[PDB]
Protein backbone atom coordinates (compact mmCIF):
# COMPACT_ATOMS: atom_id res chain seq x y z
CA UNK A 1 0.00 0.00 0.00
CA UNK A 2 2.53 2.46 1.44
CA UNK A 3 6.25 2.93 -0.32
CA UNK A 4 9.00 5.39 0.63
CA UNK A 5 8.51 7.33 -2.63
CA UNK A 6 4.86 8.66 -1.09
CA UNK A 7 7.38 10.99 1.65
CA UNK A 8 9.51 13.28 1.86
CA UNK A 9 12.36 12.47 4.01
CA UNK A 10 13.29 15.05 6.89
CA UNK A 11 16.52 15.19 9.38
CA UNK A 12 16.66 12.04 11.98
CA UNK A 13 15.05 12.17 15.30
CA UNK A 14 16.89 9.65 16.73
CA UNK A 15 19.39 6.44 16.46
CA UNK A 16 17.59 2.86 16.58
CA UNK A 17 19.12 -0.48 17.30
CA UNK A 18 18.24 -1.16 13.69
CA UNK A 19 18.34 1.79 12.21
CA UNK A 20 17.08 5.13 12.94
CA UNK A 21 13.71 7.23 13.38
CA UNK A 22 13.61 10.21 10.72
CA UNK A 23 11.04 12.93 10.42
CA UNK A 24 9.07 12.39 7.11
CA UNK A 25 6.19 13.96 5.55
CA UNK A 26 3.47 12.22 3.46
CA UNK A 27 3.83 13.81 0.10
CA UNK A 28 -0.18 13.47 -0.66
CA UNK A 29 -1.75 14.81 2.52
CA UNK A 30 1.38 17.04 4.20
CA UNK A 31 1.05 14.25 7.35
CA UNK A 32 3.85 14.61 9.38
CA UNK A 33 5.20 11.82 10.93
CA UNK A 34 8.06 9.23 12.16
CA UNK A 35 9.88 7.19 10.01
CA UNK A 36 11.18 4.32 11.60
CA UNK A 37 13.49 3.01 9.24
CA UNK A 38 15.17 -0.90 9.90
CA UNK A 39 17.92 -3.07 8.05
CA UNK A 40 16.82 -6.35 6.92
CA UNK A 41 20.12 -7.52 7.36
CA UNK A 42 20.96 -6.17 10.79
CA UNK A 43 17.34 -8.23 12.01
CA UNK A 44 18.07 -10.93 10.19
CA UNK A 45 22.02 -11.38 11.68
CA UNK A 46 20.10 -10.61 15.23
CA UNK A 47 17.51 -12.81 14.62
CA UNK A 48 14.55 -10.17 15.91
CA UNK A 49 12.50 -10.54 12.69
CA UNK A 50 9.69 -12.69 14.09
CA UNK A 51 10.08 -9.86 17.31
CA UNK A 52 9.44 -6.81 14.84
CA UNK A 53 6.26 -8.42 13.73
CA UNK A 54 5.14 -8.74 17.15
CA UNK A 55 6.19 -4.64 17.68
CA UNK A 56 3.96 -4.03 14.73
CA UNK A 57 0.80 -6.29 15.21
CA UNK A 58 0.95 -5.10 18.89
CA UNK A 59 1.06 -1.23 18.77
CA UNK A 60 -1.55 -1.22 15.69
CA UNK A 61 -3.76 -2.80 17.85
CA UNK A 62 -3.81 0.16 21.10
CA UNK A 63 -5.47 3.34 20.74
CA UNK A 64 -5.08 5.41 23.81
CA UNK A 65 -3.94 9.36 24.03
CA UNK A 66 -0.96 8.22 26.44
CA UNK A 67 0.27 5.35 23.79
CA UNK A 68 2.16 6.58 20.32
CA UNK A 69 0.54 5.44 17.27
CA UNK A 70 1.51 3.26 14.74
CA UNK A 71 -0.36 3.94 11.36
CA UNK A 72 1.03 1.47 9.28
CA UNK A 73 4.34 -0.06 7.94
CA UNK A 74 5.53 -1.41 4.84
CA UNK A 75 9.00 -2.70 3.68
CA UNK A 76 11.05 -3.08 0.39
CA UNK A 77 14.27 -4.83 -0.92
CA UNK A 78 16.62 -3.66 2.32
CA UNK A 79 14.68 -1.97 5.09
CA UNK A 80 11.13 -2.05 7.25
CA UNK A 81 9.48 1.08 7.55
CA UNK A 82 6.82 2.12 10.30
CA UNK A 83 5.09 5.00 10.37
CA UNK A 84 4.55 6.52 13.91
CA UNK A 85 2.82 9.07 15.12
CA UNK A 86 5.58 11.77 15.65
CA UNK A 87 6.11 13.11 18.71
CA UNK A 88 7.27 16.92 18.47
CA UNK A 89 9.00 17.48 21.80
CA UNK A 90 11.14 14.50 21.91
CA UNK A 91 12.16 12.31 25.01
CA UNK A 92 11.86 12.26 28.80
CA UNK A 93 15.65 11.31 28.81
CA UNK A 94 16.31 14.66 26.69
CA UNK A 95 13.65 16.41 29.47
CA UNK A 96 15.91 14.57 32.45
CA UNK A 97 19.03 15.73 30.90
CA UNK A 98 18.35 19.52 30.76
CA UNK A 99 16.46 19.66 33.93
CA UNK A 100 18.75 17.39 36.11
CA UNK A 101 15.45 16.05 38.23
CA UNK A 102 11.91 16.96 37.77
CA UNK A 103 9.70 18.36 40.77
CA UNK A 104 7.25 16.18 42.57
CA UNK A 105 4.03 17.83 40.40
CA UNK A 106 5.91 17.18 36.97
CA UNK A 107 6.97 13.44 38.36
CA UNK A 108 3.90 12.47 39.91
CA UNK A 109 1.82 13.60 36.43
CA UNK A 110 4.08 11.72 34.08
CA UNK A 111 3.40 8.21 36.47
CA UNK A 112 -0.27 9.08 36.34
CA UNK A 113 -0.01 9.12 32.65
CA UNK A 114 2.17 6.13 32.30
CA UNK A 115 -0.20 4.05 34.86
CA UNK A 116 -3.30 4.79 32.55
CA UNK A 117 -1.14 3.88 29.50
CA UNK A 118 -0.19 0.75 31.19
CA UNK A 119 -3.35 0.24 32.77
CA UNK A 120 -4.83 0.09 29.12
CA UNK A 121 -1.92 -2.45 27.43
CA UNK A 122 -2.36 -4.82 30.78
CA UNK A 123 -6.11 -4.78 29.61
CA UNK A 124 -5.30 -6.36 26.19
CA UNK A 125 -2.34 -8.57 29.00
CA UNK A 126 -0.02 -6.51 26.50
CA UNK A 127 3.38 -6.07 28.62
CA UNK A 128 5.20 -3.55 27.34
CA UNK A 129 8.75 -4.74 28.79
CA UNK A 130 10.76 -1.53 27.76
CA UNK A 131 9.68 1.29 29.91
CA UNK A 132 12.86 3.75 29.89
CA UNK A 133 12.93 7.49 29.91
CA UNK A 134 14.37 7.12 25.71
CA UNK A 135 11.47 5.31 24.76
CA UNK A 136 8.81 8.49 27.21
CA UNK A 137 7.90 10.91 23.81
CA UNK A 138 5.92 14.09 24.70
CA UNK A 139 3.17 15.13 22.54
CA UNK A 140 2.18 19.28 21.60
CA UNK A 141 0.70 19.92 24.89
CA UNK A 142 3.99 17.78 26.80
CA UNK A 143 1.96 15.23 27.25
CA UNK A 144 3.60 11.69 28.07
CA UNK A 145 3.42 8.88 25.38
CA UNK A 146 4.75 5.46 25.54
CA UNK A 147 6.79 4.26 22.88
CA UNK A 148 8.88 1.51 20.99
CA UNK A 149 6.85 -1.75 21.38
CA UNK A 150 9.74 -3.42 20.21
CA UNK A 151 10.05 -5.78 23.38
CA UNK A 152 6.44 -5.99 23.64
CA UNK A 153 4.61 -9.60 24.43
CA UNK A 154 1.76 -11.04 25.51
CA UNK A 155 1.52 -12.01 29.51
CA UNK A 156 2.69 -14.53 30.75
CA UNK A 157 6.04 -14.78 28.85
CA UNK A 158 9.18 -16.26 29.49
CA UNK A 159 10.76 -14.89 26.06
CA UNK A 160 14.17 -13.97 26.95
CA UNK A 161 21.00 -1.36 26.34
CA UNK A 162 21.61 -1.30 30.19
CA UNK A 163 19.37 -3.43 32.62
CA UNK A 164 18.37 0.02 34.90
CA UNK A 165 14.71 -1.14 34.13
CA UNK A 166 14.65 -4.74 34.31
CA UNK A 167 12.75 -6.34 37.28
CA UNK A 168 14.50 -9.43 38.67
CA UNK A 169 12.26 -12.32 37.25
CA UNK A 170 12.97 -10.99 33.43
CA UNK A 171 16.62 -11.11 34.19
CA UNK A 172 17.74 -14.36 35.13
CA UNK A 173 14.98 -15.21 32.67
CA UNK A 174 12.33 -16.61 34.24
CA UNK A 175 8.65 -16.54 33.87
CA UNK A 176 6.87 -12.97 33.80
CA UNK A 177 4.07 -10.93 33.32
CA UNK A 178 1.98 -7.09 33.34
CA UNK A 179 3.96 -6.63 36.80
CA UNK A 180 7.37 -5.63 34.93
CA UNK A 181 5.99 -2.46 33.83
CA UNK A 182 5.19 -2.05 37.50
CA UNK A 183 8.78 -2.43 38.83
CA UNK A 184 9.90 -0.31 35.85
CA UNK A 185 7.40 2.69 36.93
CA UNK A 186 8.86 2.58 40.21
CA UNK A 187 12.61 2.79 38.32
CA UNK A 188 10.81 6.01 36.29
CA UNK A 189 9.10 7.41 39.86
CA UNK A 190 12.92 7.35 41.45
CA UNK A 191 14.65 8.48 38.46
CA UNK A 192 12.17 11.45 37.41
CA UNK A 193 12.59 12.88 41.64
CA UNK A 194 16.40 11.62 41.89
CA UNK A 195 18.06 12.49 38.25
CA UNK A 196 19.34 8.72 38.04
CA UNK A 197 17.57 5.48 38.13
CA UNK A 198 18.48 3.59 41.45
CA UNK A 199 20.27 0.62 40.27
CA UNK A 200 22.93 2.66 38.04
CA UNK A 201 26.34 1.63 37.96
CA UNK A 202 29.43 1.74 35.93
CA UNK A 203 29.19 -1.97 35.07
CA UNK A 204 26.27 -4.56 33.72
CA UNK A 205 27.49 -7.06 36.33
CA UNK A 206 26.87 -4.38 39.53
CA UNK A 207 23.55 -3.00 38.02
CA UNK A 208 22.56 -7.07 38.16
CA UNK A 209 23.60 -7.62 41.54
CA UNK A 210 22.14 -4.41 42.97
CA UNK A 211 18.55 -5.30 40.92
CA UNK A 212 18.87 -8.87 42.23
CA UNK A 213 19.39 -7.65 46.04
CA UNK A 214 17.04 -4.88 45.30
CA UNK A 215 20.10 -2.66 46.82
CA UNK A 216 18.93 0.67 46.77
CA UNK A 217 19.29 4.24 48.55
CA UNK A 218 17.46 7.72 48.02
CA UNK A 219 18.56 10.81 48.66
CA UNK A 220 16.77 13.04 51.72
CA UNK A 221 15.65 15.27 49.67
CA UNK A 222 13.04 12.66 48.67
CA UNK A 223 9.95 12.71 50.64
CA UNK A 224 8.28 10.26 52.58
CA UNK A 225 5.42 9.72 50.04
CA UNK A 226 7.79 9.19 47.19
CA UNK A 227 9.63 6.97 48.95
CA UNK A 228 6.38 4.87 50.07
CA UNK A 229 5.17 4.58 46.32
CA UNK A 230 9.09 3.78 44.87
CA UNK A 231 9.16 1.16 47.83
CA UNK A 232 5.89 -0.69 47.07
CA UNK A 233 6.85 -0.99 42.94
CA UNK A 234 10.31 -2.04 43.86
CA UNK A 235 9.30 -5.84 45.42
CA UNK A 236 11.70 -8.15 44.42
CA UNK A 237 8.58 -10.73 44.42
CA UNK A 238 6.05 -9.41 41.30
CA UNK A 239 2.97 -10.52 43.49
CA UNK A 240 3.81 -8.09 45.79
CA UNK A 241 3.48 -4.81 44.45
CA UNK A 242 0.33 -3.25 43.83
CA UNK A 243 -2.46 -3.19 40.97
CA UNK A 244 -2.17 0.25 38.86
CA UNK A 245 -5.34 1.29 40.32
CA UNK A 246 -3.53 1.18 43.99
CA UNK A 247 -0.96 3.26 41.65
CA UNK A 248 -3.09 6.30 40.35
CA UNK A 249 -5.03 6.52 44.02
CA UNK A 250 -2.04 6.92 46.02
CA UNK A 251 -1.71 9.64 48.15
CA UNK A 252 0.81 11.28 46.96
CA UNK A 253 0.30 10.83 43.09
CA UNK A 254 -3.30 12.06 44.09
CA UNK A 255 -1.63 15.15 45.85
CA UNK A 256 0.74 16.16 43.39
CA UNK A 257 -0.78 15.13 39.81
CA UNK A 258 -2.19 16.66 37.60
C1 LIG B 1 13.56 -10.60 3.78
C2 LIG B 1 12.55 -10.06 4.77
C3 LIG B 1 11.18 -9.89 4.50
C4 LIG B 1 10.59 -10.26 3.17
O1 LIG B 1 9.50 -10.84 3.09
N1 LIG B 1 11.18 -9.70 2.04
S1 LIG B 1 10.77 -9.90 0.45
O2 LIG B 1 9.40 -9.51 0.30
O3 LIG B 1 11.15 -11.24 0.13
N2 LIG B 1 11.75 -8.87 -0.32
C5 LIG B 1 13.18 -8.89 0.03
C6 LIG B 1 11.23 -7.55 -0.71
C7 LIG B 1 10.30 -9.36 5.44
C8 LIG B 1 10.75 -8.92 6.69
C9 LIG B 1 9.83 -8.16 7.59
C10 LIG B 1 9.73 -8.48 8.95
C11 LIG B 1 8.80 -7.85 9.77
C12 LIG B 1 7.96 -6.89 9.23
CL1 LIG B 1 6.86 -6.02 10.27
C13 LIG B 1 8.03 -6.56 7.88
O4 LIG B 1 7.15 -5.60 7.37
C14 LIG B 1 6.10 -5.88 6.53
C15 LIG B 1 5.65 -7.21 6.50
N3 LIG B 1 4.58 -7.55 5.78
C16 LIG B 1 3.98 -6.58 5.10
C17 LIG B 1 4.43 -5.27 5.14
N4 LIG B 1 5.51 -4.91 5.86
C18 LIG B 1 8.99 -7.18 7.07
C19 LIG B 1 12.10 -9.11 7.02
C20 LIG B 1 12.90 -8.79 8.16
C21 LIG B 1 14.18 -9.15 7.86
N5 LIG B 1 14.22 -9.68 6.59
C22 LIG B 1 12.96 -9.66 6.05
N1 LIG C 1 7.54 9.31 16.97
C1 LIG C 1 8.70 9.84 17.34
N2 LIG C 1 8.75 11.18 17.50
C2 LIG C 1 9.90 11.74 17.91
N3 LIG C 1 11.06 11.15 18.18
C3 LIG C 1 10.99 9.82 18.00
C4 LIG C 1 9.88 9.10 17.60
N4 LIG C 1 10.15 7.74 17.59
C5 LIG C 1 11.41 7.67 17.96
N5 LIG C 1 11.98 8.89 18.21
C6 LIG C 1 13.37 9.11 18.60
O1 LIG C 1 14.16 8.06 18.05
C7 LIG C 1 14.67 7.21 19.11
C8 LIG C 1 14.73 5.78 18.66
O2 LIG C 1 13.38 5.28 18.51
P1 LIG C 1 12.81 3.89 19.05
O3 LIG C 1 11.51 3.57 18.39
O4 LIG C 1 12.72 3.87 20.57
O5 LIG C 1 13.95 2.90 18.52
P2 LIG C 1 14.68 1.60 19.10
O6 LIG C 1 13.69 0.45 19.04
O7 LIG C 1 15.90 1.39 18.26
O8 LIG C 1 15.18 1.94 20.55
C9 LIG C 1 13.74 7.52 20.28
O9 LIG C 1 14.26 7.10 21.54
C10 LIG C 1 13.56 9.03 20.11
O10 LIG C 1 14.75 9.72 20.47
O1 LIG D 1 12.21 -1.94 16.65
C1 LIG D 1 13.33 -2.42 16.75
O2 LIG D 1 14.45 -1.74 16.54
C2 LIG D 1 13.56 -3.85 17.16
C3 LIG D 1 12.60 -4.84 16.47
C4 LIG D 1 12.93 -6.29 16.83
C5 LIG D 1 13.04 -6.52 18.35
C6 LIG D 1 13.92 -5.48 19.04
C7 LIG D 1 13.48 -4.06 18.68
C8 LIG D 1 14.13 -2.95 19.46
O3 LIG D 1 15.33 -2.83 19.58
O4 LIG D 1 13.24 -2.13 19.98
CL1 LIG E 1 9.37 -16.24 18.48
CL1 LIG F 1 3.66 -7.70 1.68
MG1 LIG G 1 13.66 2.63 21.94
MG1 LIG H 1 12.95 -0.35 20.71
Redesign the pocket.
Known sequence: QWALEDFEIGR??????????Y?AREKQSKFI??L?VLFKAQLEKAGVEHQLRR?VEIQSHLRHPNI?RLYGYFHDATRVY?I?????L??V??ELQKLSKFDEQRTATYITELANALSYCHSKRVIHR?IKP??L?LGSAGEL?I??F?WSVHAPSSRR?TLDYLPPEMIEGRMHDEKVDLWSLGVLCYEFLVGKPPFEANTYQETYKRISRVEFTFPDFVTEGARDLISRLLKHNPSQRPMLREVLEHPWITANSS
Open positions: PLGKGKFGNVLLAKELLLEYAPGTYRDENLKADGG
